[PDB]
Amino acid sequence: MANMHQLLTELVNRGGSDLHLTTNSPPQIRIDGKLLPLDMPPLNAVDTKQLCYSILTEQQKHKFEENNELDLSFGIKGLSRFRGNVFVQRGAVAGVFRVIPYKILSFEELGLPPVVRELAEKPRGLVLVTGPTGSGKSTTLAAIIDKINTDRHEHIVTVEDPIEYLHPHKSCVVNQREVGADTKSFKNALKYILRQDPDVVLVGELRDLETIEAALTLAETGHLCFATLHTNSAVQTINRIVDVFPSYQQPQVRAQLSFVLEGVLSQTLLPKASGTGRVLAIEVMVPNPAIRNLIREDKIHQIYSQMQVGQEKFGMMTMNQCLYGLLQKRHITMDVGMGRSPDPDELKQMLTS
């Protein structure tokens, strides 16, 4: 048998993101998005209770037994910090434990093109980093924020659920607010953010109509606003913001977006061709004079054609062009690149070319 400390050590050593402990299965660790069972006997109810309780204080145990649910974060000296969730299934304890990295990675390490570096220099605008869950959005935002913290003498405020990467003060003052502990909600944090003299604000996901307008106000009133969406492309991102409003407001919102939008990044993590690790495929839309006019005229669909031809001038890049490069460098397999292309026949034409 192995205890909780040995299991967490193996999760870190193998570069995994998540450790799962549940009954009738061995401990499993998520490596590169897919689960892998550890070389251990299947757990029983005693094991899951013993392993999960081994990292809890007495009050955390008593709170867990009152609700059969528990969110927490904890540290193991000399290893890493982890965020754990404990719950109950089939009458037995179960647990999931997520890694919180100590180290912020650089732009080049993450495979982010240099145009993302320039967005950290934007004085006032809205920059959106979008993608499905676990597509690298938070790491890219943390990479941009750390460069601003390093390079500017301004005030950075983040509202996060939860706070992942920690930003010690460099040249900036960095305040990080965790929803549910430091602040009641995004709505509450955003209710007072304009009285907090911010320069750059990270608001998390544009969850509802009220948060879209709040992010638009910051970027339009002279601030640099960072936000995320769960869209898969630059065009789909712009459409989702506009389409949630009633049609007769929509004209105003397109005009505000055209002025404040300074960059849209859409990420996805694909399994590498070597069989270890994941590689970043990203679509980058940086508004040029042509695209900002297309936004105001509700000619959003001509943007894709403009992104296809504005790469050398503005550092723009369609998703298919990014997949193309990962195919040329043999970073991804042929099936993986096809499986994510929004238009596989277009990418096929590029490949035969």
Ligand X SMILES: Nc1ncnc2c1ncn2[C@@H]1O[C@H](COP(=O)(O)OP(=O)(O)O)[C@@H](O)[C@H]1O
- Residue 88 binding: pick among its own copies, ligand X, none (C-beta 5-8 Å cut-off by kind): its own copies
**32-40: Cβ within 8 A, 24+ apart:** 32/271, 32/272, 32/276, 32/277, 32/278, 33/134, 33/269, 33/271, 33/278, 38/7, 38/10, 40/2
Is 218 strand, coil or helix? helix
Give the whole-angstrom CA distance, residue 309 versus residue 252: 28
Residues 253-282 that bind ligand X (CB under 6 A): 269, 278, 280
**Phi, psi at 38, each rounded to 5°:** -80, 160
Contacts with its own copies in 152-181 (CB under 8 A)? 152-155, 162-163, 168-169, 171-173, 175-178, 181
Q: Is residue 15 near its own copies by the rule CB under 8 A? A: no
Contact 67, 85 (CB under 8 A): no
Biggest alpha carbon–alpha carbon distance for the chain: 65
139 near ligand X, judged by CB under 6 A: yes
Task: Name which of residues 13 to 52 contact ligand X (CB under 6 A).
Answer: 17
Cβ-based nearer residue to ligand X, 154 or 164: 164
For its own copies, the closer CB: 108 or 210:
210
Determine the Cα–Cα distance for residues 240 and 263; give it in Å rounded to an integer. Answer: 16
Residue whose CB is less far from its own copies, 99 or 284: 99
Phi, psi of 16 (to 5 degrees): -80, 160
Q: Quick one: 249 or 328, whose CB is closer to its own copies?
A: 249
Distance CA 281, CA 275 (A): 16
Q: Which does 197 bind (CB under 5 to 8 A by kind): its own copies, ligand X, none?
A: its own copies
Binding mask 108-127 toward ligand X (x if CB under 6 A, else -) reads --xx----------------
Minimal distance in Å, beta carbon 17 to its own copies?
Answer: 8
Q: How far is the CB of 179 from ligand X (least distance, A)?
A: 14
Q: Which listed residue (22, 23, 130, 138) binds ligand X by CB under 6 A?
A: 138
What track of x and - describes contact with ligand X for positions 279 through 308 (by CB under 6 A)? -x----------------------------
- Round to whole Å and give the CA distance between 115 and 235: 18
User: Please, are residues 178 and 71 in contact by the beta-carbon 8 Å criterion?
Assistant: no
Contact set with ligand X (CB under 6 A)? 17, 101, 110-111, 131, 133-140, 164, 269, 278, 280
